[PDB]
Design a protein around this ligand. Structure first.
Ligand SMILES: CNC(=S)N(Cc1ccccc1)Cc1cccnc1
Length: 283
């Protein structure tokens, strides 16, 4: 059923809360035993948001390999994503270790450091060129190279150095700065515009490791970003762009990380973003 018409049918019937609970009911439940070990309590931002054991990213160290991060592998679309929480004061070194070890080119940040008067993630990148950051626990150095500030987002060029080998790599930081403190954006135009720039950078392409995507918990805004990208890529590949079922793509993604799309409003916004993107994606 053309998602356009499915959209108008749910809107006129005001059944968004009913559709959303149906997804919550059918979603996968897999064990998260490593996340719940007592040694890992200060590595989790939220007690109720954990990576599944089968899809968790492992740090390459013998001491403690745990980080709150999941590999979302979309087989038909040929795209992979790492979805993670906003880094904590004691996991900023782990965060940059993961980017290094997974060979990522891009980091996508969908939150502000402060929202609703509370801290939603650590200040984990340098704000000035001449004041670099050293992560002593993982042996990494991070330098700000350049910053491009736009009305709806900021792009930064970062240099990550493995202090053990003196290898360096260029990481691109894509920071969506205008998601409102409550609800979702009224129009998906600026979110779609931001997505286009991520792809254009090469950050989502198979020559690199998977893109790292985060918000505060790494399931809500983060879920919306990967769901929209994957649905638009499938509409480009299929002979019948009308066979793309957004609810079925979301349940596939929820096999790899719990709780993706946190509200009925985020579900409606994901439909709007894909729907608007179709007309353009259609040539
Ligand atoms: C309102 N912007 C839309 S719907 N875009 C389409 C799109 C397709 C796939 C992924 C992201 C975005 C972007 C764009 C940029 C420059 C000129 N036209 C369109």
């Amino acid at each position: 059923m053309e998602m356009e018409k499915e959209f108008e049918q749910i809107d006129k019937s005001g059944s968004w809360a009913a559709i959303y609970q149906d997804i919550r009911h059918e979603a996968s439940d897999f064990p998260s035993r490593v996340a719940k070990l007592p040694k890992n309590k200060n590595r989790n931002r939220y007690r109720d948001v954990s990576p599944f054991d089968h899809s968790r990213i492992k740090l390459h160290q013998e001491d403690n390999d745990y980080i709150n991060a999941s590999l979302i592998k979309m087989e038909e679309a040929q795209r992979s994503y790492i979805l993670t929480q906003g880094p904590l004061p004691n996991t900023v070194g782990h965060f940059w270790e993961m980017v290094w070890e997974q060979k990522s080119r891009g980091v996508v940040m969908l939150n502000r450091v402060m929202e609703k008067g509370s801290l939603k993630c650590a200040q984990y990148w340098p704000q000035k060129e001449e004041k670099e950051m050293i992560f002593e626990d993982t042996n990494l150095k991070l330098t700000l190279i350049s910053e491009d500030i736009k009305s709806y987002y900021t792009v930064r060029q970062l240099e990550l150095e493995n202090l053990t080998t003196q290898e360096t790599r260029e990481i691109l930081h894509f920071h969506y700065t205008t998601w409102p403190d409550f609800g979702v954006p009224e129009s998906p135009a600026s979110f779609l515009n931001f997505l286009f720039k991520v792809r254009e950078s090469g950050s989502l392409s198979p020559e690199h490791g998977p893109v790292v995507v985060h918000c505060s918990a790494g399931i809500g805004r983060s879920g919306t970003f990967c769901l929209a990208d994957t649905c638009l890529l499938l509409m480009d590949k299929r002979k019948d762009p009308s066979s793309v079922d957004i609810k079925k793509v979301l349940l596939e993604m929820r096999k790899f990380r719990m709780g993706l799309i946190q509200t009925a409003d985020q579900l409606r916004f994901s439909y709007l973003a894909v729907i608007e993107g179709a007309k353009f994606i259609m040539g």
